[PDB]
Structure formats: structure tokens, C-alpha cells
């Protein structure tokens, strides 16, 4: 179906321990494909997925130079935001930025993104129109005025409607055997006694891609959302993800409970129950 490309920038100052570190990672959907780290012995944009390795030297030199320039620009930005908040030179602060594009099954732009945070709180974001800004506070208004004066939103729009979708479509074709393959979850239900009164039913989903999934427990066909313990979806390390959902059930009432699994890799949604 639809697909996304995202870059994630983290710039971290560390007074007394050198200049701020700049890290950039790129994703297509839930697959990381590049990384940059200014702390590396020799900083370079580096491949993290096999299908990006076929890009030629011009690609790697160009993205490396952009990342090296960003290392300097984000150091400037950290100095600026420290001033906008009247903060001392002694503390460590973080700028985070996420930007990129979503495309539909036909490759057309669905929406573009550019959002920033300072010390973990929203700072400034490009609106969905790709032409105006939302600033969180009076400090971010300074950045907004600077970016309005520079017509930076127009530069974001040009990138998001152009290069972003063009290269995302290229990546999707070059990595089509993985990026356009959905792997269904392997599922099972476990039973963990608690006492003579109750036991835990746990519904497992393993080895699925992409990370998007729905795992729910029902009792007599009614969703048990408030009573279900739902662990955060977690990476297996082999590109796939894992998740489980658990509910505490009265002894002997186990058959009133069903686990429902929805995932893009599945021919049809699954309904599972405990099988003693």
C-alpha cells in the first residue's frame, strides 16, 4: 500500500566534552537504511540496508557533505536556542528533527512532514500545507520569523514534493523484495496460572513486518481494552517485530476469551483461543 521515508536528526550539546554531537538516521517504513554520526572516527553517510549499497559514490559523497554541513548548522542552532531561553553555557541540550514524506500505492505524495523539538518538547513544525509554521512559544517564534524571512517553508515544500518522493520511489523499487513484502505474525496463546482463582492468557505475535499490528482480547465478543496488558512492540533484530497482549481470566472461563490478530501479512485476520 502506502509508504514513508523519514529522517531523524538528534543534535546534543555537552559543555566541557567537545562540540555538540550530530546523529542522523534514515528510514523507509520500519527499515533503517542510512546513518551518520559526527563522533565517528571518519564521519560518513553509511549504509544500513543492503539495497542502498548499490548507490554510487556521488550519492555517498553528497549525503556525507550535507550531513557534515548539518553538523555545523545544528551547532549554530543549539547556540541560538540556548540564547532564546536565557540558558547558561553549562547545561546539555538537545534539538531533534523529523522530516519526510508519505506516498500512496501509486507513488503520489500523500503528506509531507517537518517537525522539531527542543529538550524533548515540541518547538516548531511545518503545517500540512507545507507553507506555514506552528511555533510552540515565543522562542520558537524567533525561529519562525527567521524562516519566514528566508522562505524556508518553500524550500521544504520543494524538497518534499520533489526529491523526497522521487528517491522514496527509487528505494521502494530497489528494495522491493523486502520493503514491499509484509511478513505475517506467527501466533500462539499461552496460559500462566496465578492462583486457584485466576490465570493469565497471553497472546503472542512474532516475526512480523512491518511493525503495525492489532492484538486484542475479547470476552464474550466484547473488547477487553481496559483489562488487557499490551506490551510495546519491540524489534527482534532481524527486521521483524514482536508483541504480546495479556488478560487475567477466572479459572474455567478461558473459553469465553478470544485473541484477535490483524496484520498486513495475513491472508485474513486471526481468531485464537487457548488450546489446553
Amino acid at each position: 500500500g502506502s509508504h514513508s521515508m523519514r529522517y531523524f536528526y538528534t543534535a546534543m550539546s555537552r559543555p566541557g566534552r567537545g562540540e555538540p554531537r550530530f546523529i542522523a538516521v534514515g528510514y523507509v517504513d520500519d527499515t533503517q537504511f542510512v546513518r551518520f554520526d559526527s563522533d565517528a572516527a571518519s564521519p560518513r553517510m553509511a549504509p544500513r540496508a543492503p539495497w542502498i549499497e548499490q548507490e554510487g559514490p556521488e550519492y555517498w559523497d553528497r549525503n556525507t557533505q550535507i550531513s557534515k554541513t548539518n553538523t555545523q548548522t545544528y551547532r549554530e542552532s543549539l547556540r541560538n536556542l540556548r540564547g532564546y531561553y536565557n540558558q547558561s553555557e553549562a547545561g546539555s541540550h538537545i534539538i531533534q528533527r523529523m522530516y519526510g514524506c508519505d506516498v500512496g500505492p501509486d507513488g503520489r505524495l500523500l503528506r509531507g512532514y517537518d517537525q522539531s523539538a527542543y529538550d524533548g518538547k515540541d518547538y516548531i513544525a511545518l503545517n500540512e500545507d507545507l507553507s506555514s509554521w506552528t511555533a510552540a512559544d515565543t522562542a520558537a517564534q524567533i525561529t519562525q520569523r527567521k524562516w519566514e524571512a528566508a522562505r524556508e517553508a518553500e524550500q521544504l515544500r520543494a524538497y518534499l514534493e520533489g526529491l523526497c518522493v522521487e528517491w522514496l520511489r527509487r528505494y521502494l523499487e530497489n528494495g522491493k523484495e523486502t520493503l514491499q513484502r509484509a511478513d505475517p505474525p506467527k501466533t500462539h496463546v499461552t496460559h500462566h496460572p496465578i492462583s486457584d482463582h485466576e490465570a493469565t492468557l497471553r497472546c503472542w505475535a512474532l516475526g512480523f513486518y512491518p511493525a503495525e499490528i492489532t492484538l486484542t482480547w475479547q470476552r464474550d465478543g466484547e473488547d477487553q481494552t481496559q483489562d488487557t496488558e499490551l506490551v510495546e512492540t519491540r524489534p527482534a533484530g532481524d527486521r521483524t517485530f514482536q508483541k504480546w497482549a495479556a488478560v487475567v481470566v477466572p479459572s474455567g472461563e478461558e473459553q469465553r476469551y478470544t485473541c484477535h490478530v490483524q496484520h498486513e501479512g495475513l491472508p485474513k485476520p486471526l481468531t485464537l483461543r487457548w488450546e489446553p
Partner: peptide
């Protein structure tokens, strides 16, 4: 592909 020529904050 990264966006080039970012303006500082």
C-alpha cells in the same frame, strides 16, 4: 536522500 542547505534555527 537528505535535504540540503538547511537554515539554522
Amino acid at each position: 536522500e537528505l535535504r540540503a542547505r538547511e537554515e539554522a534555527y
